[PDB]
């Protein structure tokens, strides 16, 4: 089993008046555990999972200092990139950053990563080997040399293979009641007559965790994609997820069709009939 800790930053310039809006959220796998929001009163990194409140005042003081620093780096960035891209001061613009680390089944560092976007487009990302950068354009080529020169990668590497993974292990342990618990989907099937000749079969997966899931219809033991609808996975809003898939079939023929569920919470795939 691999697990991930990830951090997602967003800054939207507010030209006309003020500093940019800065929202920062942290996740372990599919669980959010911290947030910061420049519009909030506290001006503090805030807890969003029960198991992180375990952490002392000095954690919240450490995290807050670091994340206000990050909002300032994004503030400079927005201005630097307005100029790189020869944009006016009139318009609103966005920077987005994501970084994180994974551990493997050995509980050891498995993976690291870091990506940057300007107005919704790649700008610069760290390479998988964590020694070097990938610039999307000639602007980003300026940033790459600056960061090469500053030895940013080596310091980012030290963090992701160290501090990041260490604290990941910490959170997994502290919140194992939920972070290390898999909820298998609660499945069922519904049937609706659209006419006298035809009917809709809808296969539901409710209340599962993680979010990763596979739902497919088979007819007489072969996959069927024709005449189906498959909604995107959606949060229930209690930390679990939902999904469904539907097929349109001739009335009286429902027995040919099986729904097939794949999920980590299940040791063996599930098969459902009418």
């Amino acid at each position: 089993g691999s697990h991930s800790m990830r951090y997602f930053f967003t800054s939207v310039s507010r030209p006309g008046r003020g500093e940019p809006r800065f929202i920062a959220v942290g996740y372990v796998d599919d669980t959010q555990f911290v947030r910061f929001d420049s519009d909030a009163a506290s001006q503090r990194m805030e807890p969003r999972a029960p198991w992180i409140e375990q952490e002392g005042p000095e954690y919240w003081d450490g995290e807050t200092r670091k994340v206000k620093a990050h909002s300032q780096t994004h503030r400079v960035d927005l201005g630097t990139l307005r100029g790189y891209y020869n944009q006016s001061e009139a318009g609103s613009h966005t920077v987005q950053r994501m970084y994180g680390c994974d551990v493997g089944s050995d509980w050891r560092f498995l993976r690291g990563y870091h990506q940057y976007a300007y107005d919704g487009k790649d700008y610069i990302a760290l390479k998988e080997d964590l020694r070097s950068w990938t610039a999307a354009d000639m602007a980003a080529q300026t940033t790459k040399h600056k960061w090469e020169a500053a030895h940013v990668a080596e310091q980012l590497r030290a963090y992701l293979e160290g501090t990041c993974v260490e604290w990941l292990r910490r959170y997994l342990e502290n919140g194992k009641e939920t972070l290390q618990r898999t909820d298998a989907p609660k499945t069922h099937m519904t049937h609706h007559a659209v006419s006298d000749h035809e009917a809709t079969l809808r296969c539901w997966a409710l209340s599962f965790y993680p979010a990763e899931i596979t739902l497919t219809w088979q007819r007489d033991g072969e996959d069927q994609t024709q005449d189906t609808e498959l909604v995107e996975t959606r949060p229930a809003g209690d930390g679990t997820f939902q999904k469904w898939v539907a097929v349109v079939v001739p009335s009286g023929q429902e027995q040919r069709y099986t729904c097939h569920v794949q999920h980590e919470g299940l040791p063996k795939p599930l098969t459902l009939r009418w």
Partner: peptide, 9 residues
């Protein structure tokens, strides 16, 4: 636990 991020683009 976040990184200390102080490099600008």
């Amino acid at each position: 636990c976040i990184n200390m991020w102080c490099w600008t683009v």
